[PDB]
């Protein structure tokens, strides 16, 4: 099953403040109107160059994610788990079960912060570049039942973790979600007077978008 990410998965590409300007950036983005896999639940998926993840399920249903390679005790793995009061992020040679793991030896990284998670849609972007695991997120109300919403909303930086490991595969920890993949695309991003991205053009979507990017206009 597939759904249409009409204009979803756009995030602030850097930490530079901009306002009242159209900025052209080359980065890993979810291509506009791409096919996003619609999962019900819970398989192990490839990470590729980065992952777009979205769900409308409650915080007590989707607990977190595991990122790594062999996802066993042979290598370092990244475990992100939320609970009622906090979020715990660890990198260890975990031996996962089937409450998530039986052992966590050779730990190299630990981080603790506030929780990451008519309905409410939660969107995340996971990137792993030069040893840094970058997470972007957005939380927005939604009135849809069988698909992704239309409209534009940019995702903000949530955390940037100096974990220093390679990620090739990942799995969602459950107690109904969408998965897409990022590609190297050129986007024209529109910043309003408050420095908020309110729109975007995918310069490689169609002839009209190409024209808009060329002329730097919407």
């Amino acid at each position, epitope marked *: 099953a597939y759904t249409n990410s009409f204009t979803r998965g756009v995030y602030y590409p850097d930490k530079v403040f901009r306002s009242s300007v159209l900025h052209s950036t080359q980065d890993l983005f979810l291509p506009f109107f791409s096919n996003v896999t619609w999962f019900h639940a819970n398989p192990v998926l490839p990470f590729n160059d980065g992952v777009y993840f979205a769900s409308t399920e409650k915080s007590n249903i989707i607990r977190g994610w595991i990122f790594g390679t062999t996802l*066993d005790s042979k290598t370092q793995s990244l475990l992100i788990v939320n609970n009622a009061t906090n979020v715990v992020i660890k990198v260890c040679e975990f031996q996962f079960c089937n409450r998530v793991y039986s052992s966590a030896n050779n730990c190299t990284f630990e981080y603790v912060s506030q929780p990451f998670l008519f309905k409410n849609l939660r969107e995340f972007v996971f990137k792993n570049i030069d040893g840094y695991f970058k997470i972007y997120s957005k939380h927005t109300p939604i009135n849809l039942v069988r698909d992704l919403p239309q409209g534009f909303s940019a995702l903000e930086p949530l955390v940037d973790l100096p974990i220093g490991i390679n990620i*090739t595969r990942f799995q969602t920890l459950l107690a109904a979600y969408y998965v897409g993949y990022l590609q190297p695309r050129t986007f024209l991003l529109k910043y309003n007077e408050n420095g908020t991205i309110t729109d975007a053009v995918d310069c490689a979507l169609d002839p009209l978008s190409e024209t808009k990017c060329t002329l730097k206009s919407f």
Partner: antibody
Amino acid sequence: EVQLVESGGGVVQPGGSLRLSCAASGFTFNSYGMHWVRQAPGKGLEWVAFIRYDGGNKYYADSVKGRFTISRDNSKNTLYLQMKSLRAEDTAVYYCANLKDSRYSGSYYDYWGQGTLVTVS
Amino acid sequence: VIWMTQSPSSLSASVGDRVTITCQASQDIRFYLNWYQQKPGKAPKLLISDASNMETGVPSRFSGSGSGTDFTFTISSLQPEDIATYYCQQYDNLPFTFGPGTKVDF
């Protein structure tokens, strides 16, 4: 049900060319990298080529490098192999596959097609 | 390119016998080795990944272990349905390679 169906095999002359295709269904084709593997009559398995999920990066075995080209169309869920300057040594059954690989493709599942015979004579 | 070798190229065994197949890499491939089982006219089936991780649906009589250059595949008690050619494959680096193949018969 996951399926991989090879087609486009047949008999060609030495120095000629043949294009194979593999129709994929039952799985998220555009999320996985894909491989071609061939097996000559009475011989073991030999890896031929690999393409990433976006079709961007391509890798070949030294024995076919410069003669074979790998490509994919993610809108048709179809993998292709274009073989030029075919030699007698290229006679083999060609398979498309998603090989389990924790380092490069990130595939957690192993899928194979039934294979198609290419004869050079 | 990593050269893969297997030994024995062929072995005979009865039902209930213990069967061991050796696979050796010319380079240290850590634990990035797959084991396949192929029967005549069929595509190869994966039995073991990451040197020693068993695939789902694979009988408990199958096992494997090893690290670096020397790996072993074992059938603790050969069954009539285990008559096949076994291959080892490395995916530590590209190009990927398969071993010669070991034929098991009665």
